[PDB]
Design a protein around this ligand. Structure first.
Ligand SMILES: Nc1nc2c(ncn2[C@@H]2O[C@H](COP(=O)(O)OP(=O)(O)O[C@H]3O[C@H](CO)[C@@H](O)[C@H](O)[C@@H]3O)[C@@H](O)[C@H]2O)c(=O)[nH]1
Ligand SMILES: Nc1nc2c(ncn2[C@@H]2O[C@H](COP(=O)(O)OP(=O)(O)O)[C@@H](O)[C@H]2O)c(=O)[nH]1
Lengths: 172, 163
């Protein structure tokens, strides 16, 4: 019943694309985004996802590009539609500053494992969207941000005028 | 800063967990769970291991479902629900008593539902996304007279055919 298609990315080594099964009917849908047994095994030895976060964002909002050298993330969209972007920011990688983009919605329920040393970002195409992500990292008690349109990455976003700040959304 | 926890004053074992949120006109950012803050509430090193979502249309009811082993952590991450917890431990002094919570983005209560409790929710908004975690069997009718839950409707969608 509860199953995962787990595929390594075709272009960015370390990135996994995880698609769950869903029970769908006219009342709605039921699905499992994560189990420890199926998904924590993808992390390095003895690391586990320990944090669950949600970002509810309006139409045309961008979040990112954010990352660091320690935090692994697991990300999807549980309401509406996003364009989810992962950027390889490991300077020694053969795919350094290359990216992969995923259009995630209820009919394309990809869940992206974003490794340490990758930038993370998403853009909301629907009226609003709820972003869901899990976090895993060593060391609890104690980092890079790239501009959404950084020319060196050259991300093909579905807009040229996204909302980046509170002051931007007053205009719309 | 990421912050959270109150024990229910009617059902022993039930916790009501409210996170803080950063809010602005673009929307909301918040943490529903950390292992350190929330897994400590479970017995004997048990941990939440499962994450599930239920997207349901307006007027749908789910429940009342439970068992004697599964602990749950439940909230609503889009829209609005009425979340209900029912003590179904036969030896409990509050057996078949319930507690109800109206959960939406301005009232982001996250309910820890212990083993031996029935779980249910009803969707008041156009649609809702229910989020719950599981750590690890009975089903009661939504309108069971012995429980007597004050639901905000008398004609909920209970099956596909009801649509
Ligand atoms: N309560 C709570 N607050 C949080 C959480 N996560 C982040 N915050 C708080 O929410 C505020 C905004 O968070 P971010 O927007 O993630 O901060 P940032 O990474 O510095 O913002 C950068 O990216 C934005 C686009 O995503 C840019 O618009 C901005 O200029 C900057 O480059 C910060 O004050 C941060 O402390 C959480 O889980 N819970
Ligand atoms: N693929 C998948 N199916 C599930 C999951 N949870 C429950 N189901 C199935 O969805 C169907 C409906 O579940 P049920 O509890 O009977 O309905 P409800 O009372 O309306 O939630 C059943 O046939 C279950 O086996 C899940 O996490 N993933």
């Amino acid at each position: 019943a509860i199953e995962f298609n787990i595929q390594e990315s075709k272009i960015l080594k370390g990135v996994y694309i995880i698609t769950p099964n869903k029970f769908r009917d006219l009342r709605g849908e039921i699905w499992t985004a994560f189990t420890s047994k199926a998904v924590d095994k993808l992390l390095p030895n003895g690391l586990k996802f320990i944090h669950d976060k949600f970002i509810h964002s309006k139409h045309n909002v961008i979040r990112g590009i954010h990352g660091d050298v320690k935090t692994y993330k697991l990300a999807t969209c549980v309401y509406g539609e996003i364009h989810q972007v992962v950027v390889d920011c490991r300077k020694d990688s053969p795919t350094y500053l290359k990216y992969e983009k995923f259009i995630i919605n209820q009919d394309n329920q990809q869940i992206i494992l974003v490794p340490a040393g990758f930038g993370n970002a998403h853009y909301v195409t629907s009226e609003s969207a709820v972003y869901y992500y899990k976090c895993a990292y060593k060391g609890d008690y104690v980092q890079f941000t790239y501009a959404w349109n950084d020319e060196r990455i050259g991300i093909d976003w579905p807009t040229n005028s996204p909302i980046l700040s509170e002051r931007d959304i007053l205009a719309t």
